[PDB]
Amino acid sequence: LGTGLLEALLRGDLAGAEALFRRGLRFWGPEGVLEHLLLPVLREVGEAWARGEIGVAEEHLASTFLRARLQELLDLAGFPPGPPVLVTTPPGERHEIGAMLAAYHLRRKGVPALYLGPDTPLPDLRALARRLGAGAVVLSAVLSEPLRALPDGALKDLAPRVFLGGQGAGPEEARRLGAEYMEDLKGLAEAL
Amino acid sequence: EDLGTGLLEALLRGDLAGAEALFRRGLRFWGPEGVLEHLLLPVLREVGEAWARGEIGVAEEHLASTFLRARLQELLDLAGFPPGPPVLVTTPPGERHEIGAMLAAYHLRRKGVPALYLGPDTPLPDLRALARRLGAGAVVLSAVLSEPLRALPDGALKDLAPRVFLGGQGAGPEEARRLGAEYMEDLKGLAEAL
Amino acid sequence: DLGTGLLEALLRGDLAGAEALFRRGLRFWGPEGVLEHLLLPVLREVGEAWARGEIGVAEEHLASTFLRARLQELLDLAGFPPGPPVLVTTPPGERHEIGAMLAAYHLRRKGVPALYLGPDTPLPDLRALARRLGAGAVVLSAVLSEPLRALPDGALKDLAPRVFLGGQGAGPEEARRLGAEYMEDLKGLAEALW
Amino acid sequence: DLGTGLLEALLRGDLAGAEALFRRGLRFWGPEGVLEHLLLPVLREVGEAWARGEIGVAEEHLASTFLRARLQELLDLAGFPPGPPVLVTTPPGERHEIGAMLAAYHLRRKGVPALYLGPDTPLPDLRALARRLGAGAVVLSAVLSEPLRALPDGALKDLAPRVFLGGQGAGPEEARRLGAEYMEDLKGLAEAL
């Protein structure tokens, strides 16, 4: 399915790509299709670009497509009432699908995760959390560099709980920034 | 808007692929709740009226119903299922119309309530035992027909769970009161009351 | 074996856990394997446990409703090819539908357009739909024997150009009396029709 | 006003309410109409409110992300017809993507297979994908002027046999310098093809 989907995308067959994604969804289930189809295809797109096998426009097409599929699943999940959890990425972080995954996992567990989009200045994020009485903020870091650019303690009081995760993040950097480090998306809902 | 006619027609000619495409269009246009209200419900109602007029047979209704039930079940599984005390959702003994109960479960889950849809037609002692064993916060019943409610003794629903809700075309305030359930008119009011 | 874990998760209302275990079975054993080694044994065990007084009706309902939804997913994934449809249902008075769903699944897996109607379809209505859609066959699942016994000699004979009957409620003798082709194995079905 | 209601629902993080109001607009105005009467005015007002210091970036982000999801839904509902595709994106350094999405939507609604790439595509990569898909045209949305100004003379030439440039950041003179056809109106796009 992963191969088929990427091949369909690279020949501009959006309809066929959508059918293959839906097949993955029916077999693996919602979480499973993300783990077994969406994530491996995105990773492979990145590796192929890095090896010079595809260009940026091919990656863009695939990413935009898979982002739309995840957004579909996100809107089909519950959005419960009550204090929201704000989900975004650090300033300078333009990879948004990890944040979307975090929001999706939370919503699937009945947590009102408000996905903001990526790349939110910290004072503005803090102000929104405060004004909505958000119980937590969740950040996805794909790159390490946006975290490195932040001063010590910069995440510390965005909200009563601040969670940081993603391939760009680690325990030490979380500690330096004053966030709780989370390894697994499934641990997020537990923590809340 | 022509989607309802198109969907029914596709179903009646056994074009499941076409019917699925039309349902998906409705979903994209109206949203999850909207497609149920503006496509699924009107088509089922019209199927019932056509049958009652003698215009279609039972097999046609069955085909349509089975299809729409599967679409709603898809939406149900895509909604959140949170942890915590469940709400048990079913229909009264003798009530075999299940789509209203499925709708109730769907609306609850979309609002973050862990609605366990049991299927239809659950004996009251067995329902009570499951509620007790799972420590359910509530039971919700959909009554499409009035007759299964009329067959129940006064107060029969009273303490199935700490909260008991009754709704559907078969139910009214008076009958709810006689049976000891809280009457709900709107599916949207269900999540609120909880 | 995931069957115990799955049933246990279901009985405590852990839908997420139940779904994870079913998906694990799917990934390890595949669609056909999970039906034979997980779905069918759990349904059988649910029946035996009810019969022995160990679980109530609401527990069975929850498990059945869950597995029915999973099978409906597999049914839609097996796809609906073009061509004359095969109508799949159960006899009048037969409300156990999962056997019919299995038959539709096995047919679709072999490229046959099996239209699942849902259960419990009156024979004249079934015959009329088969005729109007130009169905090449009708397939019936009988779980109980009583609905078959209630039918007159030859009642299944001419529902469609080919009529197939199977399930635990059916046997060769009763199939012959009713004028249907008796089938034991679901995998033999597509070959018999071919 | 649905526009006021929708913005207010978004600003207080009421996604359910926001979705209901958007759906009402969609049912009343239809797909085209909801874009013109609801989606576009709200985005414009979000921009003005930010610029006046009335809302922060996180509020704009929430509104934009919501409307982008709704437009992506409309895009997929308009369908993706067969045939040589038209690639739709924004210039390198242009991160405003909703104009490009609109262009793709209008084209698809007229039966043109507009493949929306996402924003911010380097031109050699865009050229390669157009070539590989045998795309008949490329369409670019420029919201800012600066990403166009950074490009060399003729940089948009021959991305495909037809290259269209539009948006608030674009003008006839800059289109000419870059070797694109300038387009003012989204509805004129399908006509031009």
Ligand code: B12
């Ligand atoms: C798509 C993509 C882009 C797109 C993103 C589009 C979008 N709107 O989202 C665009 C074009 C913007 C892009 C740009 C760039 N990217 Co890029 N791209 C990717 C790609 C192909 C996929 C991204 C993705 O969605 N992955 C899915 C991710 C999130 O999954 P994951 O990290 O495995 O996440 C898991 C866990 O971390 C967990 N998780 C994630 N978030 C969180 C949060 C919490 C709280 C928790 C508990 C868990 C959790 O969830 C996942 C489940 O397993 C990756 C390839 C890859 N990821 O390996 C790169 C990649 C990240 N990009 C890379 C690069 C180099 C770039 C650019 C610098 C390129 C450039 N010169 O322009 C820019 C940087 C832009 C920026 N400042 O952010 C590199 C980074 C390598 C590195 N760190 O050294 C990668 C790895 C590609 C590669 N092989 O070289 N990219």
Ligand code: B12
């Ligand atoms: C499909 C169908 C069947 C199917 C059901 C299949 C299944 N597995 O669900 C089957 C074949 C089993 C069936 C059988 C029969 N049914 Co029938 N059938 C229908 C049909 C076409 C659609 C049912 C449906 O799903 N509708 C969608 C429902 C849920 O919408 P709704 O009821 O309007 O619900 C809305 C609200 O009431 C609310 N709601 C619902 N439940 C709840 C619960 C709460 C708490 C809340 C707040 C709200 C709420 O939400 C919905 C959206 O707004 C209807 C036609 C119709 N107009 O309803 C009949 C209909 C209900 N059936 C009818 C009849 C007569 C029968 C049979 C007696 C026929 C027969 N002799 O065999 C049997 C009875 C079986 C039994 N119950 O014991 C009649 C009932 C007439 C009456 N009471 O006056 C109807 C109305 C058809 C007609 N026009 O005559 N039926």
Ligand code: B12
């Ligand atoms: C779920 C269930 C129900 C559900 C069904 C829900 C639904 N929407 O489908 C409900 C709650 C409605 C129900 C009700 C009742 N049921 Co019940 N229940 C079951 C249960 C637990 C599973 C049903 C199922 O899906 N079975 C799985 C089937 C598909 O597997 P299988 O029978 O082994 O079939 C194999 C082959 O036959 C083949 N196959 C099946 N069909 C076909 C068709 C063809 C063409 C081919 C080639 C092959 C084939 O596939 C399988 C393996 O390869 C069974 C237990 C069981 N079956 O062992 C009972 C069971 C069938 N029910 C039983 C009873 C007693 C009842 C009721 C009378 C209970 C009552 N109310 O008093 C009612 C009758 C309803 C009616 N039909 O009129 C009993 C007894 C049947 C009997 N003859 O003795 C059973 C066996 C449980 C028990 N141990 O007592 N039931």
Ligand code: B12
């Ligand atoms: C949402 C938004 C963002 C988001 C975008 C998210 C996303 N993924 O798309 C983010 C946060 C990324 C953002 C960032 C910035 N943006 Co901004 N933001 C906006 C906002 C509020 C809406 C954008 C939008 O979708 N507009 C809808 C567009 C399509 O509306 P439109 O103008 O009516 O477009 C019409 C026509 O041009 C036509 N059209 C559009 N494209 C095309 C193409 C063709 C071929 C055709 C025929 C027609 C056509 O169709 C539309 C309807 O008729 C606008 C407000 C605005 N007035 O546009 C700004 C705005 C564009 N942003 C602005 C600024 C300053 C920024 C930043 C520099 C801020 C900063 N300091 O970081 C950055 C720059 C990032 C970059 N490199 O691109 C300013 C630009 C002012 C200027 N040009 O000097 C605006 C106007 C806000 C303001 N009032 O000050 N922004």
Ligand SMILES: C[C@H]1O[C@@H](n2cnc3c(N)ncnc32)[C@H](O)[C@@H]1O
């Ligand atoms: C990590 C992803 O970033 C994309 N990428 C690499 N360079 C650029 C650029 N200049 N502009 C936009 N996207 C880029 C590639 O397609 C890669 O797959």
Ligand SMILES: C[C@H]1O[C@@H](n2cnc3c(N)ncnc32)[C@H](O)[C@@H]1O
């Ligand atoms: C309410 C629905 O009940 C169905 N219906 C009517 N009579 C029967 C029967 N004998 N068996 C099964 N379903 C029946 C019809 O299809 C109608 O539309």
Ligand SMILES: C[C@H]1O[C@@H](n2cnc3c(N)ncnc32)[C@H](O)[C@@H]1O
């Ligand atoms: C075959 C299955 O039928 C279910 N069953 C038994 N009696 C009833 C009833 N009155 N109503 C609904 N389901 C019932 C049991 O759960 C058993 O497991």
Ligand SMILES: C[C@H]1O[C@@H](n2cnc3c(N)ncnc32)[C@H](O)[C@@H]1O
């Ligand atoms: C044009 C839009 O850009 C957003 N915006 C302004 N500055 C930044 C920044 N540093 N990072 C991210 N988004 C920003 C604002 O929210 C404005 O509404």
